[PDB]
């Protein structure tokens, strides 16, 4: 198994609005590739 980990402090309250939408993006240019997602889980708790 090979893994990579990165961490950063991000003050969410100051960057995003109270309600948001979460999602995925992908683009290609003159060089390209296919980008697929096979599965997705998500859990949030406010309060």
């Amino acid at each position: 198994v090979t893994s990579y980990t990165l961490n950063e402090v991000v003050p969410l309250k100051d960057v995003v609005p109270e309600w948001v939408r979460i999602g995925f993006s992908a683009t290609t240019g003159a060089e390209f590739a296919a980008q697929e997602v096979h599965s997705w889980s998500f859990n949030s708790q406010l309060g």
């Binding site: 990165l6 969410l12 609005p17 979460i22 296919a34 980008q35 859990n43 949030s44 708790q45």
Partner: protein, 181 residues
């Protein structure tokens, strides 16, 4: 208190709880953001707005997301532009394409962007990517220019497992990507 939770282990051809933008579509149990075609963009949003912080209490949500993705390119020296997981305002529409990943419009900090993205950048844009030209994972806040990056060796066609967690107590966003081999 509010909590939200969802799991999708296989995508339906008519995934009504997702919003698709650009070429994003579902097919064969999978969510395709882009096909291996030139100059294109695709996005897929979960349709429910998520309550991330509260005005009133000043509380901030703890959250965790996990997903499996694959990037399939013609070869190791022909791959662009990348993929991201992002958090944006509810009304978010695709922004600039190519090196901007469909989520940003500039390398300068843009407060009105209000978008945080975790990128998996496969193509070196000289105007703002790390000087080493290596492919990398990065944390982006209102700009295409990451606040922090980590070199990453793309395994062409391999399924990567990603976990992205946010700890409201420390404001620390952590990203972990794992490959089987």
């Amino acid at each position: 208190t509010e909590t939200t939770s969802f799991s999708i282990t296989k995508f339906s051809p008519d995934q009504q709880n997702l919003i698709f933008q650009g070429d994003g579509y579902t097919t064969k149990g999978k969510l395709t953001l882009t096909k291996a075609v030139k100059s294109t963009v695709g996005r897929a949003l979960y349709s429910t707005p998520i309550h991330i912080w509260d005005r009133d209490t000043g509380n901030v949500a703890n959250f965790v997301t996990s997903f499996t993705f694959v990037i399939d390119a013609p070869s190791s020296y022909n791959v662009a532009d990348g993929f991201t997981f992002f958090i944006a305002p509810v009304d978010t529409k695709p922004q600039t394409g190519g090196g901007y990943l469909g989520v940003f419009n500039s390398k300068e900090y843009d407060k009105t962007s209000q978008t945080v993205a975790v990128e998996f950048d496969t193509f070196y844009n000289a105007a703002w990517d790390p000087s080493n030209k290596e492919r990398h994972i990065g944390i982006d806040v209102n700009s295409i220019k990451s606040v922090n990056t980590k070199s990453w060796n793309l395994q062409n066609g391999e399924r990567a497992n990603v976990v992205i967690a946010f700890n409201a107590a420390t404001n620390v966003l952590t990203v972990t990507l794992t490959y089987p081999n």
